[PDB]
Design a protein around this ligand. Structure first.
Ligand code: BEF
Ligand SMILES: [Mn+2]
Length: 117
């Protein structure tokens, strides 16, 4: 299965990529919202892990845009942790929302859980 990881911080991106690889997933990466949409269209990932504070296009806009055409599972992963952030994320179409700092194992488990549907 193929995961698109969207995050503008390379160290965070790398950590997630390392862990999903070790899990057997094919990983594709994007470092801003424009790249996220471009990779989504080119790669057709099975699941997107989606940072919110991004250059070019923010994660909410990315999610809103993707949802015009696709029901691909989206897991938002953000330092933004307020009630408002989580609720708007989910209402815009995120299937799950995980906050930074995060557990690698819990991220793994939630990806498996989302894929399971
Ligand atoms: F910049 Be992500 F919203 F932690
Ligand atoms: Mn960010």
């Amino acid at each position: 299965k193929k995961i698109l990881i969207v995050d503008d911080e390379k160290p965070i991106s790398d950590i997630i990529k390392f862990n999903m690889t070790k899990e057997g997933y094919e990983v594709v990466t994007a470092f801003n919202g424009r790249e996220a949409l471009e990779q989504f269209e080119a790669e057709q990932p099975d699941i997107i892990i989606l940072d919110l504070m991004l250059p070019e296009i923010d994660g909410l806009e990315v999610a809103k845009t993707i949802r015009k055409t696709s029901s691909v599972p989206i897991l938002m992963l953000s330092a933004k942790d307020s009630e408002f952030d989580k609720v708007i994320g989910l209402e815009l179409g995120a299937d799950d929302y995980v906050t930074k700092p995060f557990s690698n194992r819990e991220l793994q488990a939630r990806v498996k859980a989302l894929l399971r549907r």
